[PDB]
Design a protein around this ligand. Structure first.
Ligand SMILES: *[C@@](O)(CO)[C@H](C[C@@H]1CCNC1=O)NC(=O)[C@H](CC(C)C)NC(=O)c1cc2c(OC)cccc2[nH]1
Ligand SMILES: *[C@@](O)(CO)[C@H](C[C@@H]1CCNC1=O)NC(=O)[C@H](CC(C)C)NC(=O)c1cc2c(OC)cccc2[nH]1
Lengths: 299, 299
């Protein structure tokens, strides 16, 4: 198994660049609106402690340079929604895919299309950590790059890139401008909360192992969900939600291993370790594959 | 620092479905030619030992059903180049990018666009192993998926997918239809030569780790090129040439770490193990980033 991104073409056709003064970043052109991080309106000095409502009043439509390639799109309106700017343009993007804006939960994976000056550069899979950071690869100029999943040609946009933490992980918003995690779009050193292991994804990994005949860790025990969650937290694992239990349903049906039976197997792994053995060839338990990712790659 | 694929949009617009009888796979549509694996002409019985020229002479243009999305393309002629079939169609692909066919060297990387029934499914980075396999993710119906690099809007196609070895690694051809490695397009269980580790890539990856702020594996020792190669060959690593040393020049200049100093670090990692520590999140030495991959991503 390996990290597989979605084909990026439907998103590539939506990337533009947005410039205010000398500040340039990326934007997302869907129908006749361009979405981008609101800090494009900031001068490099104003980012240190910005007042976005006051900064935005000083701006007019003609202050915004939106370019598809080197072709300018005329801006006819502007508004701010949380930390994203919405620029109405006079052309509906003919490459707009079927799309949705969704806000994901920790553990969910998505593809990131890293972009610079409106030009796509590369694509890779990320997982939203429980501390609401992602382990990306982003340089200067990457803000406004988006993350997405594609289901039956419908693109669900879930991430817009804003910041690199001092630890080198990355933080951002959904496409309604609401940050994931406790971060703010100011030029300031911010720290995420201590991270945890994504339990639902580790369980997905164990199901993947079972699907492939690697099942030594299956045990004779079961557990209640509450009992499991209390043990999980003492090993820095996330507690399971009812939604986690339900997204494991398909894999549980496919293998015949009840979710709570797999929880009891993981619990034993947590208290006694792998004892020198491997699962799917690895000595480490992987927590960046969702149940959907496993089904995607196994079936 | 992440395994990063090229944006796949320019290739997505070229993927089609090719069907001959009950056999279907993917094809690559460029200008007015569709390229696909020639075993699409084989029935299940033919595939055990196909005499391809004999089988192709018996097919007509209308035996080939080519579908692009929903629209059917009419085949107006066909020729065979080694293991690749070239179907001339009566419509030019309007989305054909600037492109080239290239045969890549062992150790080089490329992006794979995995496709099923002519529809792109996922994108990820692969390296051509020294034993001329690739460690990919391909399921039933993935034949004809292609591997590629992109440089300033020009797509260099280097791989077309044909088979999965019993070990789970993958084998295929260049776009001239010549296999990488000693493999043959027949339905038999085929073994590869013993694989070795791409030494220059491991070194590039260690430099990537240093550029990203990890230095724990460095040491105060040096080695000569030949003494390093002696230990490298002992551990089934490929020899490091003076060309490799020169290619690593920029990464050494960026970090101020002499190439042979980093060879001494790798020598220690090989002789001492990693001791449960990790480099860029990996518990194993990674050899599928080239020096260019590191430079392109880190800057
Ligand atoms: C954008 O592209 C801005 O348009 C940029 C993306 C990062 C640059 C390097 N890698 C990236 O991911 N984002 C920023 O520069 C943001 C801008 C804010 C949200 C207005 N700032 C940071 O990410 C940032 C600031 C500071 C900092 O200060 C002082 C100290 C430490 C870390 C840090 N990150
Ligand atoms: C294609 O898609 C065929 O159109 C298919 C791709 C593989 C299927 C599973 N994963 C893949 O990557 N390729 C094949 O099925 C090829 C067909 C050849 C080129 C005619 N065959 C194999 O990959 C193959 C055959 C055998 C085998 O026999 C007997 C025994 C063991 C392994 C094996 N692999």
């Amino acid at each position: 198994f390996r990290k597989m991104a979605f084909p990026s073409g439907k998103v590539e056709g939506c990337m533009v660049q947005v410039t205010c003064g000398t500040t340039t970043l990326n934007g997302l052109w869907l129908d006749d609106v361009v979405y981008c991080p609101r800090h494009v309106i900031c001068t490099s000095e104003d980012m240190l402690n910005p007042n976005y409502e006051d900064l935005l009043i000083r701006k007019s439509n003609h202050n915004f340079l939106v370019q598809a390639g080197n072709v300018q799109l005329r801006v006819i309106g502007h508004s701010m929604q949380n930390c994203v700017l919405k620029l109405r343009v006079d052309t509906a993007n003919p490459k707009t895919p079927k799309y949705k804006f969704v806000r994901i939960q920790p553990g969910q994976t998505f593809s990131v299309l890293a972009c610079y000056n409106g030009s796509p550069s590369g694509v890779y899979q990320c997982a939203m950590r429980p501390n609401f950071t992602i382990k990306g690869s982003f340089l200067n100029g990457s803000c406004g790059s988006v993350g997405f999943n594609i289901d039956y040609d419908c693109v669900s946009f879930c991430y817009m890139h804003h910041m690199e933490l001092p630890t080198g992980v990355h933080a951002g918003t959904d496409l309604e401008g609401n940050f994931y995690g406790p971060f703010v779009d100011r030029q300031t050193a911010q720290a995420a909360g201590t991270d945890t292991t994504i339990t639902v994804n580790v369980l997905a990994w164990l199901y993947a192992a079972v699907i492939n005949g690697d099942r030594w860790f299956l045990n004779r025990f079961t557990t209640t969900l509450n009992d499991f969650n209390l043990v999980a937290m003492k090993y820095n694992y996330e507690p399971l939600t009812q939604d986690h239990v339900d997204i494991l349903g398909p894999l549980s049906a496919q293998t015949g291993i009840a979710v709570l039976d797999m929880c009891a197997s993981l619990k034993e792994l947590l208290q006694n370790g792998m004892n020198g053995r491997t699962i799917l060839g690895s000595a480490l338990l992987e927590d960046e594959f969702t149940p959907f990712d496993v089904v995607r790659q196994c079936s």
